[PDB]
Amino acid sequence: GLVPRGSAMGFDDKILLITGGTGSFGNAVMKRFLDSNIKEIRIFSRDEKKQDDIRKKYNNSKLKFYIGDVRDSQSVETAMRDVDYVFHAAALKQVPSCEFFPVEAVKTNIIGTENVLQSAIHQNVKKVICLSTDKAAYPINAMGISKAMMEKVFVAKSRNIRSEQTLICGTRYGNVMASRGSVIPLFIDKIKAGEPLTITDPDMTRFLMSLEDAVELVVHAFKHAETGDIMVQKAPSSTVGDLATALLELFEADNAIEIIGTRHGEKKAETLLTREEYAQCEDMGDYFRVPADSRDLNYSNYVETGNEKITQSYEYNSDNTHILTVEEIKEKLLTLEYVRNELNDY
Amino acid sequence: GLVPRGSAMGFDDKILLITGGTGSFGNAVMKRFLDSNIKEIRIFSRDEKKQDDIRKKYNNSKLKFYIGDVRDSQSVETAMRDVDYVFHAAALKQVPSCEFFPVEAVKTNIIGTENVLQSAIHQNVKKVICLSTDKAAYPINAMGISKAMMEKVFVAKSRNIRSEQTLICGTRYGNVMASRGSVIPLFIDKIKAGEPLTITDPDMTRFLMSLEDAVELVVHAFKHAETGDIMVQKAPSSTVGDLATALLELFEADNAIEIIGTRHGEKKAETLLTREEYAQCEDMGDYFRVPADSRDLNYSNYVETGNEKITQSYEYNSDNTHILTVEEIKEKLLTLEYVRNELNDYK
Amino acid sequence: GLVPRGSAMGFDDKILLITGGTGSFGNAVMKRFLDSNIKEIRIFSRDEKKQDDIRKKYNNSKLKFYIGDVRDSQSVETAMRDVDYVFHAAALKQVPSCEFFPVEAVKTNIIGTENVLQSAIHQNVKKVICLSTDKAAYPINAMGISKAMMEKVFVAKSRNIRSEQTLICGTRYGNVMASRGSVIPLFIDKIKAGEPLTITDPDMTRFLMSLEDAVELVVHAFKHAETGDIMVQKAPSSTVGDLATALLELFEADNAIEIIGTRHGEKKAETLLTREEYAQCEDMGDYFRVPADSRDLNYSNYVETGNEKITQSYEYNSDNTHILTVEEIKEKLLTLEYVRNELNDYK
Amino acid sequence: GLVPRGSAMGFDDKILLITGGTGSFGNAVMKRFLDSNIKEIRIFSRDEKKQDDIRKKYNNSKLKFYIGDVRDSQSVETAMRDVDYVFHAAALKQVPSCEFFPVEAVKTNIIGTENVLQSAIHQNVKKVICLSTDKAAYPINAMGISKAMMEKVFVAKSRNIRSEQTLICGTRYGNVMASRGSVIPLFIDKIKAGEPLTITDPDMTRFLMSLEDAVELVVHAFKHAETGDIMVQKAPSSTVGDLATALLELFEADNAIEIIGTRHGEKKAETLLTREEYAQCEDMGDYFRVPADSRDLNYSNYVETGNEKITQSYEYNSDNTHILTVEEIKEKLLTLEYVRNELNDY
Amino acid sequence: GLVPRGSAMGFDDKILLITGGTGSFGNAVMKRFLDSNIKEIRIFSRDEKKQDDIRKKYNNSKLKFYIGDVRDSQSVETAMRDVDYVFHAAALKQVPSCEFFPVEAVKTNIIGTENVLQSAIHQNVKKVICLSTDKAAYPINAMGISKAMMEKVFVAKSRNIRSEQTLICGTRYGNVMASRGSVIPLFIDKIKAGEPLTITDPDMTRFLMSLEDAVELVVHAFKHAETGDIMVQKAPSSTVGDLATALLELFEADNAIEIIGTRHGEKKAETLLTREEYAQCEDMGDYFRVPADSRDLNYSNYVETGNEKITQSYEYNSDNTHILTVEEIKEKLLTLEYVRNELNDY
Ligand SMILES: CC(=O)N[C@H]1[C@@H](OP(=O)(O)OP(=O)(O)OC[C@H]2O[C@@H](n3ccc(=O)[nH]c3=O)[C@H](O)[C@@H]2O)O[C@H](CN=[N+]=N)[C@@H](O)[C@@H]1O
Ligand SMILES: CC(=O)N[C@H]1[C@@H](OP(=O)(O)OP(=O)(O)OC[C@H]2O[C@@H](n3ccc(=O)[nH]c3=O)[C@H](O)[C@@H]2O)O[C@H](CN=[N+]=N)[C@@H](O)[C@@H]1O
Ligand SMILES: CC(=O)N[C@H]1[C@@H](OP(=O)(O)OP(=O)(O)OC[C@H]2O[C@@H](n3ccc(=O)[nH]c3=O)[C@H](O)[C@@H]2O)O[C@H](CN=[N+]=N)[C@@H](O)[C@@H]1O
Ligand SMILES: CC(=O)N[C@H]1[C@@H](OP(=O)(O)OP(=O)(O)OC[C@H]2O[C@@H](n3ccc(=O)[nH]c3=O)[C@H](O)[C@@H]2O)O[C@H](CN=[N+]=N)[C@@H](O)[C@@H]1O
Ligand SMILES: CC(=O)N[C@H]1[C@@H](OP(=O)(O)OP(=O)(O)OC[C@H]2O[C@@H](n3ccc(=O)[nH]c3=O)[C@H](O)[C@@H]2O)O[C@H](CN=[N+]=N)[C@@H](O)[C@@H]1O
Ligand code: NA
Ligand code: NA
């Protein structure tokens, strides 16, 4: 549900703004809230085409289409007036595009976020949920470094704005299974083309999250996050070599593997909580919550006083979570209707 | 050597601009270049008071004092006209203050650097060297993250602007030994006051670099870096417990150790080259050079083509260099005039 | 012909920048210039995903993919360095979305164009061709008004900057046949689904232009426009009722027609040249050239001196060109591969 | 009067801001409100001279002189604090000056307006009345195109701001008779110089409005416009050939006519309501009101659903209004004290 | 005390912001308020070092350290939220640095001040006290001219903002005795080096103010200034030749004097109140208060109506105040612990 258990919450008079609202996450979130009594869902983005396709597709009076840009504070102000909740998903998110145009990454992902937070604070928005990526933890590419910096920026407001004025929090998850351009559809197309599957490093591990998992994470933060939190879903992982086997077997395919080597900007394993975060997080069940530290702007935690619990802690990553067997991966894959439709047609 | 063996530069008609000029780094680089034939060293910062002290202290006709702020392009442009070389050291560099004010860290360390680079390109500057830190590699704190992003910003120029137009490169090094506020003067003060030494985690390792090491790394980049390069100096490391022991012994002191635990914003070990950087780097001897990849803006190294050499590389860090022994740390500590003076003053 | 008969251009050392590069117009111009000796075609937009699809689809070394936004001058300047030719197609071009967000239409279509022009002048670009629409002539909707104002902005340069510095011109054409979201694919879908064809006003006339027509108009301007020129392609028109009949017949289909009435934001007939433009234009054959007036900034053509030729001119519009017959419309519709494929797939 | 009939309106505690307040319309509006109990009339403009001449001329404690620029939002904010009503008349309004410097036209007429609207909304201004021109309908020159765009910008706020917060509307009229530089004083001076009257196109028609007519239009909008309205005064027209005859006869002059031809940037006839506007306007008597459409940002009126009433409608212009005879034009001319003083001295 | 006599004032829930808070005045003001029940003292400046030294030095939970820049309105907004009082001391204040970089002087001293005032007005700050210098009266160098302009800017808000919203006032004093770089420590070091004292012009007069005097002036304005006031402390002066004698005698030193001549950018005498200010000030005892004129923006005081009291008035400067004898100067010097410690060690 969209409401905590035993909660006195009604959406009848509320307005949700989604930035990046035409992207595929913005889109699944929109569908989740359309099934609610929310008054208005504002879809905010520069893409007049995407907006018109959605408008015609859903034909739903809850949906409002705003043209604007997170880089421009006046364009954000216009869509922010009267809004109660913001799911901030606008971002430059491709690794190579950010690597070659990092100033562009900073204007959208960092300054764009700060525009949206300042405007939500000015308009008395109740909640802002910022989206981030496991590429933000111990980051190595311009994309993940811009998102790690975006986290620092949204966290820093909790050392400055009253939760009862505007609650600001964020969610961090890995690439979603079967998202466009990702390795599941790459492999599947290779299978169907009778071409070899190109594996970078078969011993790489990545967390496995469906789109539905990633939408539930955003809804969990929307319901339970306190201001300054970063919220992560616990998730299993697999090696890429095993994901490939799994897809081979499901499609009963005989395609060879071709090892192409690790690409620029990629880790062997992804981290979801650094050592410090893991040391300080609270376990909410299927989620970890990382509370903002030093909300009173006391510096001494950084300088004079330390914690032997940080000294003793480990980081949370795709090598030390539950690494799925080949049969577990097939099972998880069969929960994805994307995989199922492709499996049928084959 | 401000110049490669077998080279001559006239610096005689050249102009060096140092941002961050009044800080202790700009200051040691400044002093290095005063002993050259350089025509003019422009000290650029907003600290009018420190500028006046440096002016009075050195009393040297080569030095010019410019007021201005890397956050303001017109302020930089005023100081950049006719400059040949820029050492870009302006930064917000404390961890806690970047953590709490990260928009200010982006404004000075990222947007400020881009202002300096765009103006240096506009004014036909020959080289810009950007200073960075080992806290930028696999960064955890807002400060190291902002410096990581600055590195991506200065490297991205080498895939747009042409080396014989403006060579743009950077150096990355760890905390300098005996710097203002760092653990060596902390520990020495604790000794002298007869108080216990507050150790966070005795098994932490940190690269050991003197100020003169760091100044040599900048000069090595100035002479030898190509556009897009990140230059690092190979360095030994020590554990924090052995650094305490070494000082305790040099000072013949018996203060207790008190373990206060790991502070927020800090790692067990520092990384100087990530796995991908190590795999791609060139060994210059006592230095590694990380060349910029994909100078022609081709995306296929990121998407379709990979490299097995990245796959079986690992990272260069303060646990896998040479970790000094207690007696090696004392030998290094004794090379520092700060340590000698403290020790002398101690009887 | 990317070059006038009796000319040679080496494009071999030349660089073309397309703003709006990922849209369907930039895409067809791009494909046109891939078959030339052009050194590099830079696709400029903020759509990182569409850029990656184009990159993978074409796999052509001439293509470079730049992230950036016509609203940001430094973003444009990065992509404009060393460019020889700019096709400026970036725009907000839907009517309802410019109507409801007209400040966004001004930011992208007017201020965005001025950013592109100032940077092209700064970087010594040889030509910029700006794309415009017949909704800009006697405009009624925020979209056509913003494009009318963009035309005034690019024409006003020719009364300031010098042709052998940067030639600046534009093309104006109507909706392209079978474009995304346009009435032809609407009607074909309605046929295939066995639903009635929703006609607004059957007596509306619109100029008929294919995508290849439109691409030829841009190439005609690139070869032949002078600075300040607005170029238009002469074109026939049809009424909307005959376009429906033509499709109904090609598809041997019997769907009813439903009249829904004129929508907000639309005219009965489109204008391609106003009265003043017609009076002043040169006939190039299948094209009209509208020269920029008063290149020396003299005001007297506006105040003290008039022209009897403007007085007895009229306007070039979709009612006074050649209005195609049903059978002529079917002949034109059959030249489009989109229509052929739809028709083929239909049995 | 300044107050609707039967209305409970008092100006005792209200503040009016006029931008472009030193221009000749700003000036007649000022004189109209000086005859009221308004507390303060702020005259806002860059022209320190014009302001000091007015200050000395009127010597009236209601008048306050602010220096500022509609292009600068901070300069507008300073004059906007505590204001109840704004008559926004600042503009670049010469045809050739806008044609040659259209970026200048956009910064004053379009962005300048958006600065004034955002600031009036921030300061809780009750009413903003924007002035526009018949050159804005089916516009052909940079000046009228910038004003047509300005209309779209002020209308668009009614799809976003509550009338009870800030009512935003606009008025559209043609050139005013006997305004400086206009054809009535040009002709009259030709008469007095014994030179031929230079007529562009004798068959051109233009609406005839006195300055007093144009001030009554602004007051009518101030009293009755709802948010998003464009308000036009019904007005007769004349051919230029007939205006010239009329002036010739009134002055009993024998001057020849010289035909100089249509100039750049001029239409044969002016439009006051386009076809779409005319189809949707309400007739208030001597005025038409064009209501803002789609205030709920429903797109479908643009895309899926049409109106056969638009299909059937005609536009409202100076050829299809009442075209005055030569005797009617003389009569109207004799109501203008400008014409009378010139007639006497002659 | 920090509270007027008989005043109902409590600092328990109040927040003070100090810009330029790491400079030596910002620092003495901070120490004064630390001795009070104020809830928070925010130290605002770009100098992360200075801030950390203070934090460690005082180790006091009242102190909060903000990084920011008066030149950036968003950086000021962050530190201004929830603030009750601002002591605005950020400035470029060296004569030669402003002379050579006057654009820099204008961005910090003039535009920086206007950022801080606009933000204090937006955040409903109760009081802003701006600091200025006697070099601002009849100014001759870029530094004093930028500060004279800063005074005009803060005064001008009182012709526009209600005191009950935000009271804006300023204090004007000369260089403080024994401040860093000033002539007392220069001379003293000359004495101790056995070098000649370099005197510019022995007949120059300057007002003598201790740091404690200058802090009491700021506290007096904080307690009693009304909006638009400039507040000056009455102060005696000395000739430089006499200051030098005094120091010579106190240290029983035989150093010669060397006359170096007047330097660029220096007056013979400093003015604290111009003629106009002196004519209009109220004498509060040990302070003069200069009230803002024409708070209703009536121009006529400038143009049509004059005051024979201005015609008759004199200016208040270091030649017409009480010029101290050599023995008086020694006495005043001995109240400065700086002088005392130096005297001892010698
Ligand atoms: C374009 C690019 O270089 N990488 C975009 C992409 O992020 P990335 O982490 O590469 O995800 P993927 O699903 O491709 O690889 C997963 C695993 O399979 C491996 N992999 C991948 C491709 C391949 O051919 N073979 C292979 O083994 C690969 O090494 C890894 O171990 O998609 C992201 C998010 N997509 N969404 N939403 C964007 O942020 C990025 O810009
Ligand atoms: C303020 C702060 O949090 N750290 C500033 C500082 O970065 P940092 O890495 O802390 O260097 P240090 O010299 O303090 O620690 C070395 C080792 O001693 C250990 N350490 C440190 C302090 C102590 O009391 N005990 C202790 O064991 C400690 O855990 C570590 O393992 O110095 C940087 C460079 N400039 N200087 N100095 C600034 O960028 C930073 O803001
Ligand atoms: C969204 C919208 O309102 N109109 C977009 C569109 O501009 P437009 O002029 O509508 O072109 P079209 O191809 O729809 O109509 C042709 C004729 O068919 C008639 N028409 C149209 C639709 C219909 O259902 N019935 C009908 O008779 C119609 O009245 C007309 O007489 O296409 C433009 C260019 N890009 N495309 N496609 C975008 O700039 C616009 O935002
Ligand atoms: C400077 C310029 O080119 N035109 C300014 C002007 O707008 P415009 O519409 O020309 O009004 P006018 O009163 O001149 O012509 C009326 C009729 O008489 C005709 N006309 C005019 C001059 C002439 O010599 N002969 C003639 O027949 C003319 O063709 C037309 O049919 O004044 C406007 C508003 N003025 N006010 N307030 C400004 O917006 C413009 O910048
Ligand atoms: C750097 C510079 O040129 N002047 C800074 C300085 O302001 P200023 O008024 O010079 O004060 P000082 O204490 O030096 O002279 C007092 C008298 O002694 C005389 N004087 C001074 C020096 C000397 O060698 N001999 C001498 O006779 C001198 O002529 C004068 O009659 O300190 C100021 C504030 N400092 N604080 N806080 C800054 O605003 C300025 O930038
Ligand atoms: Na922040
Ligand atoms: Na708008």
Residue numbers in the entry:
A (entry chain B), D (entry chain B), E (entry chain B): -8 to 337
B (entry chain A), C (entry chain A): -8 to 338
Text of the article:
The third structure corresponds to wild-type protein (coenzyme-free) in complex with the substrate analogue UDP-6N3-GlcNAc. The substrate-analogue UDP-6N3-GlcNAc is clearly visible in the electron density map. The electron density of the azide moiety is weaker than that in other sections of the substrate analogue, probably because of radiation damage at this functional group. Although the sugar ring of the substrate analogue protrudes into the coenzyme domain (where the active site is located), it occupies a non-catalytic conformation compared with that of other representative SDR enzymes. The conformation of UDP-6N3-GlcNAc bound to CapE is similar to that of the inhibitor UDP-D-GalNAc bound to the homologous enzyme FlaA1. In particular, the UDP moiety of the substrate analogue establishes numerous H-bond and electrostatic interactions with polar residues of the protein. Unexpectedly, the coenzyme moiety is not observed in the structure of CapE in complex with substrate analogue. The latch is not observed in the two crystal structures of CapE with coenzyme bound because of dynamic disorder. In contrast, the latch is clearly observed in the structure with substrate analogue bound (see below). The analysis with DYNDOM indicates that the substrate-binding domain rotates 11° and moves a few angstroms towards the coenzyme-binding domain upon exit of the coenzyme and binding of substrate analogue. The latch is a flexible element that increases the contact surface area of adjacent monomers of CapE in the presence of the substrate analogue UDP-6N3-GlcNAc.
